[PDB]
């Protein structure tokens, strides 16, 4: 009796699996154990395996707006992400443009790489007057900094109006 973790059965024999970084070149015979060989250039296997051949790393195609965040090796897969302004969509298997936040709403920060924009309504004293996937709500102008007075108050969609009166 033996564990499925590092071993497998074949011809009424308990044989040893191949370590990550190696593939199963030939199965165990009645006279010898498994033969495991290193994965070739740009190939990997990430588990203890009985695998015929190694897996080729995915291409982080810049033409798909992808970039490697982790290169991978003979032991680990390559990790890609969509470049700024886009996020991975598993339906199209492609980098889709981020959702824009309407006026009165701002983009939540910190902005997460490879993830779509989360929109939040502007709080008291802040406004947003644009459609944007990156812009947060900006705070109202302080009229006093312009040497002026507050004539009319702002909304979540528009700024304060400043007046130079006497």
């Amino acid at each position: 009796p033996c564990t499925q973790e590092r071993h497998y059965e074949h011809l009424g024999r308990c044989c040893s699996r191949c370590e990550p970084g190696k593939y199963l070149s030939s199965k165990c015979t009645p006279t010898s154990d498994s033969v495991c060989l290193p994965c070739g250039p740009d190939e990997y296997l990430d588990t203890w395996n009985e695998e015929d051949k190694c897996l080729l790393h995915k291409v982080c195609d810049a033409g798909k707006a992808l970039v490697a965040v982790d290169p991978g090796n003979h032991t680990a897969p390559r990790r890609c992400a969509c470049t700024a302004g886009y996020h991975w969509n598993s339906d199209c298997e492609c980098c889709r443009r981020n959702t824009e936040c309407a006026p009165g709403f701002g983009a939540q920060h910190p902005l997460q790489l490879n993830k779509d924009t989360v929109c939040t309504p502007c709080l008291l004293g802040f406004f947003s007057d644009v459609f944007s996937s990156t812009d947060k709500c900006k705070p109202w102008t302080n009229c006093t900094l312009l040497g002026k007075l507050e004539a009319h108050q702002g909304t979540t969609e528009s700024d304060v109006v400043c007046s130079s009166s006497m």
Binding site: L55, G85, C94, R96
Partner: protein, 156 residues
Amino acid sequence: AQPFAHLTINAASIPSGSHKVTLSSWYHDRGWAKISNMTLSNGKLRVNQDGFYYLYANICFRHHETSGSVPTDYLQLMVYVVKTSIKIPSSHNLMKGGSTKNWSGNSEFHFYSINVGGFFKLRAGEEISIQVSNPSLLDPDQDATYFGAFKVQDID
């Protein structure tokens, strides 16, 4: 041993530009790429054993907006499966596929794939190769851009 080849695009050597080219770099060993009793040299697949082979190609084109706007607005995406011979310097089209496209709309991504296949009599010494219209639009994925051959029967 019965001859075959399934060749996937060498993602690290796709030519740039918008003029038609012969693809001269393919994988023959890694991933799904494989070859047996045929020889491969700079994108030319040499036949070593006379016979009737089934020939096939799958080519994918793609463009994302982060690469900028797609140059002019005449766009025809084409594959040609071409036969040459170390004997005859001249080359001839075996198979042809593709479509005219308009990728000038305002969406972030554009995609199109071509597939072709056929049954051909091939002599040892003859070479099969692939031509594409817009090399800088080629999808570098192994499941995307590939071509192959396998022997079905002897000449007799």
